[PDB]
């Protein structure tokens, strides 16, 4: 909700930023293919997330739209598009961890995310943890 | 703080860096671009009287001869906090003018 | 008019009790005193031929120096006067001129201040040095009632070479600074 905007499409090269690590939560949802995820999609996932286990734990959505997706009105050529119209999106490079759950069973957690994946226009993978950290 | 550096505005080589203490005044001829000093004329770190101004002169005469001796003349004055006033080198010899 | 009790006393009376009370070593590590700044704010220089270089010197008498006409640093549409000029008189008494004024303050003015009970021991609050503001301008021996054409006090600051308000507070409690504990 700010700054001067209606920006350049730009492209998604290798996913040099497609691969973080569960930061909070317990289990997670990492992306396999690069893409633009419409807020419309995030919610549509998150919602079903919470909704899968009514009155459950916590949901963390690390990805976040901010890129304005413009579009023409159904005509020809003459200056950038009315822009936005539908809205904004976030850019996901294969490997980024989109959503992550916690405070619940793996049977409940794992199965929860699985659904989300159906909402997102990508191919996903689910992860656990115990991996990366900065301890000794 | 005083960022004076009234100097720094010295481009024509040869600097007559002065320095007034609270009893003794020191003057010094320096070559920049090649950091080194040549002529020197302190106040009491020399000897002479005990009167600032009075001294401030006989202390400059010092630089005169001393300098001229090794082929020095045209130069520019100096010292930043200086405040061109009491302390003085109003003396013959050096073509530093003033 | 060169040396005054307050000044005098400070030395042959305050120093000691202080050297002891607290406990120093070097007479310079001591609680010296060196600057008083009676400053006014007035209110304006607005319309109706507002010269107000009147209370200017009115102030001078109460002190000794001539104050410096202060000017605006910014501009505020909220309450008139903007950009430059305007007014905000100020003056700095150092050494002598200072001592005396205080001495005259601490023995005639404050007394007499409207009612008076003491001073605010919280005004230092800790940070070395003090502060305080007087409402009336005619609470001074030099000025008169048939003189002042309009009330308009101000505020005066004072500086201590000491830090801890503790010290600072003692130095003044000794110099005769009254205190509404």
């Amino acid at each position: 909700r700010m700054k001067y905007r209606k920006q350049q499409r730009g492209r998604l090269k290798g996913a040099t930023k497609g691969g973080d690590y569960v930061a909070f939560g317990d289990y997670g949802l990492v992306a396999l293919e690069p893409a633009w995820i419409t807020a419309q999609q995030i919610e549509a996932a998150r919602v079903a997330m919470v909704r899968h286990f009514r009155r459950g734990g916590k949901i963390f959505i690390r990805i976040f739209p901010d890129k304005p997706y413009t579009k023409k009105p159904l005509e020809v050529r003459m200056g950038k598009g009315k822009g936005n119209v539908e809205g904004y999106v976030a850019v996901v490079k294969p490997g980024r961890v989109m959503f992550e759950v916690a405070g619940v069973t793996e049977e409940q957690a794992m199965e929860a995310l699985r659904i989300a994946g159906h909402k997102l226009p990508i191919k996903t993978k689910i992860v656990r943890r115990d991996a990366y950290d900065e301890a000794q | 703080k005083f960022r004076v550096r009234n100097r720094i505005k010295r481009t024509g080589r040869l600097r007559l860096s002065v320095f007034r203490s609270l009893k003794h005044i020191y003057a010094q001829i320096i070559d920049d671009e090649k950091g080194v000093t040549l002529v020197s004329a302190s106040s009491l770190a020399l000897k002479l009287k005990g009167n600032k101004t009075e001294v401030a002169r006989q202390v400059g005469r010092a630089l005169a001869e001393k300098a001229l001796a090794l082929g020095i003349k045209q130069v520019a004055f100096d010292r930043g906090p200086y405040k061109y006033h009491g302390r003085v080198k109003a003396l013959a010899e050096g073509a530093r003018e003033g | 008019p060169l040396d005054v009790a307050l000044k005098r006393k400070y030395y042959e009376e305050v120093r000691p009790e202080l050297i002891r009370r607290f406990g120093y070593q070097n007479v310079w590590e001591v609680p010296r005193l060196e600057k008083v700044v009676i400053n006014q704010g007035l209110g304006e220089a607005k319309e109706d031929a507002r010269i107000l270089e009147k209370a200017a010197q009115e102030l001078a008498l109460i002190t000794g120096q001539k104050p410096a006409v202060t000017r605006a640093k910014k501009s505020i549409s909220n309450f008139k006067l903007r950009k430059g000029m305007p007014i905000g008189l100020r003056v700095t008494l150092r050494r002598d001129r200072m001592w005396i004024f205080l001495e005259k303050l601490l023995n005639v003015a404050l007394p007499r201040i409207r009612d008076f009970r003491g001073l605010n021991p919280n005004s230092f609050d800790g940070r070395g040095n003090y502060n305080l503001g007087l409402r009336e301008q005619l609470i001074f021996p030099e000025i008169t009632y048939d003189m002042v054409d309009a009330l308009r006090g101000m505020d005066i600051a004072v500086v201590t070479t000491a830090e801890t308000d503790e010290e600072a507070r003692a130095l003044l409690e000794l110099l005769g600074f009254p205190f509404r504990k």
């Binding site: - | - | 005054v4 001539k66 007394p111 021996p141």
Partner: protein, 49 residues
Amino acid sequence: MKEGIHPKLVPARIICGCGNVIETYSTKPEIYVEVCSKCHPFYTGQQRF
């Protein structure tokens, strides 16, 4: 301390007892006690006994 700016000195200094009748020096209201004191409710019952 410069030109016709200043004003003077003379005795407008150590003139200690410069007529405290001016209003009051370290005379009254020494910051001690003055007229009567308190009114006191109940502690002051002169009705009867």
